[PDB]
Design a protein around this ligand. Structure first.
Ligand code: HEC
Ligand code: HEC
Lengths: 80, 80
């Protein structure tokens, strides 16, 4: 039960629900940092959408310019 | 950049950081609901700890009785 889980400290490491459908950017950065074409790969996913890397729910194509997608990929790849 | 990501709606589906190291319980429930020995499997992971199912960071053995671990597994498996 929930307050049992709270009392035993479990919620220090677990949440009840993933609020968001997409991966946190820091996890995207971890998965791709140190890989050579990740800015092209990420920019393309942001602009055109994709599914199946993290789960079944897809990301729709996003209304960004090629420049904006590239900058967002670069930003995400800099996450510390 | 961050306010670019905010402005383009991205943060409706993504967070900057996964605050917590462990999977959200609703994702644990999804992964195991409809499987026959999941209460024994989960109770055992809660009590004894484990790693590698969701990632590298391990869950330490947790200070619960066998009864408490079973009840927590059952609770988690009921999550809607
Ligand atoms: C970190 C210091 C933890 C605390 C305290 C608790 N949990 Fe945990 N849990 C943690 C991690 C890093 C993981 C993933 C382990 C892995 O294999 O990658 C888990 C996992 C679970 C699970 C799923 C186990 C599985 O094999 O899928 C459950 C059901 C679970 N955790 C429950 C749970 C409970 C009830 C806790 C308090 C008694 C609890 N955890 C504490 C990290 C940590
Ligand atoms: C839901 C309605 C989304 C919004 C709006 C945006 N994102 Fe998204 N994103 C979403 C999902 C469900 C996923 C996982 C897709 C999968 O393959 O399982 C993603 C993924 C990303 C990624 C990683 C792509 C990869 O192949 O690993 C990035 C870099 C990303 N998303 C960024 C991003 C940006 C910058 C957004 C606003 C312009 C954005 N997403 C919106 C869901 C949704």
């Amino acid at each position: 039960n929930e307050q049992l889980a709270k009392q035993k400290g479990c919620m220090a490491c677990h949440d009840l629900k993933a609020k968001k459908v997409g991966p946190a950017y820091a996890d995207v950065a971890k998965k791709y940092a140190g890989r050579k074409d990740a800015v092209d790969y990420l920019a393309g996913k942001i602009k055109k959408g994709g599914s199946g890397v993290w789960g079944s729910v897809p990301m729709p194509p996003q209304n960004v310019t090629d420049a904006e997608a590239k900058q967002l990929a670069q930003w995400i790849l800099s996450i510390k």
